[PDB]
Every structure is written in structure tokens, then in C-alpha cells.
């Protein structure tokens, strides 16, 4: 596993849609089941375990986040954050874990 940019700075205006991308490729030595997480540090906000989504975890963000692509097993872990507000400043961790590899992405969102 490998994320294209392990950390960067993103800037968006309040009331816009926030794009927090998370791309990856798969080395040959990876053959296990897929797992994708998303964290926030002002706590999971959306999971992808067993090819099914579990995403009712953060009460402050209900429906305000959902994956973009329809090929999540191809290297797309991006989330579509809509209707940005002021209580949404915090570092995000796109933690993907495919046996036996692991890779993260530290998205520090500022508004």
C-alpha cells in the first residue's frame, strides 16, 4: 500500500463542499481483505469493512459525508464533505489496512 500524499494543507470557504482525497495503489504482495477508516482529531466517522459501509458514528456529521467513487476497491477512499461549517477544523487520518500493508494520510483541514 501507498498513499499519494501522506499530508497536505487544504483550504475551503464556509458553505462549500470539501474534497479530502485519499488515493492508493496496490503492491503485488497485498492479497488480504480490504479495510478503510477515517478519523478526526478536534473518533471514526465512516468505515468500509467487508465490502459494506458503516457510517453512522459521528453525531455532529450525519449524512454530511459519503464516499465518492463506485470502485472503492480500486484506490479511491475520498470523502465528499458538504456544507462546511466552523466546528469542522481538525486533522483527518485516512487509515487503510490491506493485509499485510498499511498506509495513512494526514489531512489537516483549516477554514
Amino acid at each position: 500500500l501507498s498513499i499519494t500524499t501522506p499530508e497536505e494543507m487544504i483550504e475551503k470557504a464556509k458553505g462549500e463542499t470539501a474534497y479530502l482525497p485519499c488515493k492508493f495503489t496496490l503492491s503485488p504482495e497485498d492479497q488480504g481483505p480490504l479495510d478503510i477508516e477515517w478519523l478526526i482529531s478536534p473518533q471514526v466517522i465512516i468505515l468500509y469493512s467487508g465490502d459494506k459501509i458503516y457510517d453512522d458514528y459521528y453525531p455532529d456529521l450525519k449524512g454530511r459525508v459519503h464516499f465518492t467513487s463506485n470502485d472503492l476497491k480500486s484506490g479511491d477512499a475520498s470523502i465528499n464533505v458538504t456544507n462546511l461549517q466552523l466546528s469542522d477544523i481538525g486533522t483527518y487520518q485516512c487509515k487503510v489496512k490491506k493485509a499485510p500493508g498499511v498506509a495513512n494520510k494526514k489531512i489537516h483541514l483549516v477554514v
Binding site: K23, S27, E29, G32, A99, P100
Partner: protein, 267 residues
């Protein structure tokens, strides 16, 4: 024999053949010998350059990685992708060249350690470890009590304590004609994603686990892995790495001066 050349006598000359002055612009290093700028005596030289060859410089074992796994726990087992980028005392010896080609000789030094048990009269028999090697693409186990371990045709080795450390030999397993310790250029035709990543040197994983069960008290073990490049041939030498390594994937660094400094140019 690889003997060095002796030195021949000389006499004080006065001629128009100057060996000292040359032109360093041509990228051609000098070739003078002390017998050309002073008077020398004919000294037979018996020194030998044998202990500086490639196979005397590389064929020495060096720890690469070591992991721990407890007995009394679920999925207590160690995995590891096979790469030499992680330890720095060996990484630097392999960066002196660009394209290496060698076959390998692993060696595992497995040890145990009794954990803080709680029951009374703890006593365990000898232990047995398994070190399973999965080629790139095979099925990987998920827990210790799994059926990918036994019912498999991958190369694995069974070892029990109190004996000599196990050892297997691995031939030259690659797609090209040499391992590349450097690769400038992306891995997607669109020139996106990770930068210095190559499929040429992948070698698979290594799964290890206990074979006994949980008798009365946990036992954390530890395995150390040792390489030994044999039959090696090196190509396109390279200057030695100066700045301290920071990551295992790329060659990132922080800038640091060329040498430690002195008080004045004449001291």
C-alpha cells in the same frame, strides 16, 4: 593472486617528459607512480587486494528486522514484507551500487521469554515455531488457528528450541536482470502516485507463529532475520549516502554540511 605492483628504481633525470603536469579537465584521473617524481628503490611488494573484493565485502550476515508475537493471544503472529530498506547498517552497503545481482542465505535466531503468568506451578515443554514464506500473490493467513497454514504448498520451515538456528537458501528471484537499489521514475503511465516504487525487487512476505497451544502462561517470542548476499556482482558504482535516512520508501533527508569543521584552514 591479485598482487599489487612493485616499484621500480629511478635516476635523477633532466628531460622534456613531464609526468607531473597534466590536465584534469579531461575527466581522466592521473596515473603517475612515485617512481616518476623522486628517486625510489626497487621494493618487491607482496601485499594482496583479496580482502577488498566484492564477495569479501558483502558476504557477511546482517540483521534486517525482528518482530515479537505473544502466545496467549488471538492472532499472535508476525508478518513482514521482505525488503532491505529498513536497517541502516546494511542499507548503506547496498546503496554503493545501483544494480546488484545475488542469491541469498537467510538465517533466523528465534528466542523466547516467559511472560508474567498468574497461576501456580507453571511448566511448559519445548516450543516449536513455524516460519511460512508467501510468494507475492499467494493467500495470506488471518489468524493463528487458520487452515492456510498447514494445507499449503509454500516453502516453510519448522524449528524447535535448543538447536541450531534454521537456514534456507533463496536463488535470484526477480523479473529483470538485477535488483535496482534506485529507480527514478513513477509507476503509473500518467505520472501520478508514489515516486520511487518498483515491482522488480519484491520478494513476498514472511508469516511466523507458534505451533503449541496455550498451556498455562503466555510466552512472547522474538525472531531475528539475517541476510547473506552470495555470488554477488555489482554494477554502476555510486557515491556513499551522507545525509541521515528518514523513511524506508523514498530517499528523503534534511540538508547537512559536507564535513565537520576545523578552526582554520592552516591548522
Amino acid at each position: 593472486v591479485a598482487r599489487v605492483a612493485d616499484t621500480i628504481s629511478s635516476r635523477p633525470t633532466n628531460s622534456e617528459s613531464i609526468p607531473a603536469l597534466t590536465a584534469a579537465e579531461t575527466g581522466h584521473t592521473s596515473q603517475v607512480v612515485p617512481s616518476d617524481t623522486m628517486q625510489t628503490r626497487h621494493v618487491k611488494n607482496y601485499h594482496s587486494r583479496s580482502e577488498s573484493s566484492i564477495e569479501n565485502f558483502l558476504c557477511r550476515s546482517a540483521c534486517v528486522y525482528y518482530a515479537t508475537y505473544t502466545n496467549n493471544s488471538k492472532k499472535g503472529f508476525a508478518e513482514w514484507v521482505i525488503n532491505t530498506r529498513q536497517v541502516a547498517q546494511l542499507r548503506r552497503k547496498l546503496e554503493l551500487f545501483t544494480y546488484l545481482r545475488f542469491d541469498l542465505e537467510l538465517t533466523f535466531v528465534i528466542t523466547s521469554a516467559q511472560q508474567p503468568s498468574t497461576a501456580s506451578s507453571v511448566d511448559a515443554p519445548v516450543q516449536t515455531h513455524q516460519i511460512m514464506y508467501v510468494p507475492p500473490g499467494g493467500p495470506v493467513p488471518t489468524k493463528v488457528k487458520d487452515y492456510a497454514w498447514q494445507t499449503s504448498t509454500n516453502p516453510s520451515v519448522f524449528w524447535t528450541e535448543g538447536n541450531a538456528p534454521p537456514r534456507m537458501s533463496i536463488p535470484f528471484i526477480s523479473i529483470g536482470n538485477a535488483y535496482s537499489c534506485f529507480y527514478d521514475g513513477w509507476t503509473q503511465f500518467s505520472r501520478n502516485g508514489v515516486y520511487g516504487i518498483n515491482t522488480l525487487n519484491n520478494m513476498g512476505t514472511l508469516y511466523m507463529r507458534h505451533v503449541n497451544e496455550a498451556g498455562q502462561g503466555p510466552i512472547k517470542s522474538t525472531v531475528r532475520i539475517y541476510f547473506k548476499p552470495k555470488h554477488v556482482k555489482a554494477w554502476v558504482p555510486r557515491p556513499p549516502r551522507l545525509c541521515q535516512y528518514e523513511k524506508q520508501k523514498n530517499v528523503n533527508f534534511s540538508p547537512i554540511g559536507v564535513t565537520t569543521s576545523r578552526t582554520d584552514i592552516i591548522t
